[PDB]
Amino acid sequence: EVQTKHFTLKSDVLFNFNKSTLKPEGQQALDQLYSQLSNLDPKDGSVVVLGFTDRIGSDAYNQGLSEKRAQSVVDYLISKGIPSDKISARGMGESNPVTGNTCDNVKPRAALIDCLAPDRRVEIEVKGV
């Protein structure tokens, strides 16, 4: 609109394996960004929280975790003062990976997790501000 902003957070800092409760350090990271994350036109400002994992979803073994995580972030952000009707969560899963083809030839489980780190992420889009 007048200004759209973008934020990216590491899932490995925000969440324990297979879980969607925000870790302390992840709470902190959301605090550190809430100032700028919440300056939106109270009329037509909007916030979208997008959960991602990597192409083997190493992040989790149960399903729905990327939606859950996105919603956990939403919930926290609402408990900081973003109104509900202004913010929504989406679970993108393996979609739109950042790493591209970079890790296709990485076979060992550990190294492949290291390599796919960039894909294990929560993105936040802010329209308005």
Side-chain angles (χ1 to χ4, degrees):
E1 281 85 312
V2 67
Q3 236 131 341
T4 292
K5 283 186 166 205
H6 299 279
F7 305 85
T8 299
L9 301 166
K10 288 169 202 164
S11 288
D12 300 350
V13 164
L14 264 58
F15 304 112
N16 287 311
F17 172 78
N18 198 42
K19 314 236 75 191
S20 48
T21 57
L22 276 173
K23 295 185 74 214
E25 311 83 347
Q27 290 182 308
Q28 302 195 68
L30 288 178
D31 294 344
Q32 267 134 64
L33 302 172
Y34 175 86
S35 347
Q36 19 181 3
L37 274 172
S38 53
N39 215 33
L40 25 64
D41 188 330
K43 271 191 231 98
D44 66 316
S46 59
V47 179
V48 176
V49 176
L50 302 167
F52 304 81
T53 191
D54 55 44
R55 70 174 173 81
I56 72 188
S58 61
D59 252 345
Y61 68 75
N62 284 139
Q63 307 302 119
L65 252 299
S66 83
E67 185 170 16
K68 276 186 205 153
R69 285 167 184 196
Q71 190 64 49
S72 233
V73 168
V74 172
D75 294 335
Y76 180 80
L77 287 179
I78 295 179
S79 88
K80 289 215 96 197
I82 311 267
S84 309
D85 60 292
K86 252 74 179 72
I87 188 178
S88 61
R90 273 121 93 148
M92 302 301 270
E94 51 172 53
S95 293
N96 319 323
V98 178
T99 59
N101 298 107
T102 301
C103 307
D104 300 358
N105 274 15
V106 182
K107 272 75 169 71
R109 292 264 198 286
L112 176 64
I113 285 170
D114 282 353
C115 184
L116 294 168
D119 304 325
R120 295 180 311 264
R121 107 219 75 127
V122 170
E123 288 169 18
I124 292 119
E125 294 159 334
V126 197
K127 285 180 110 187
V129 344

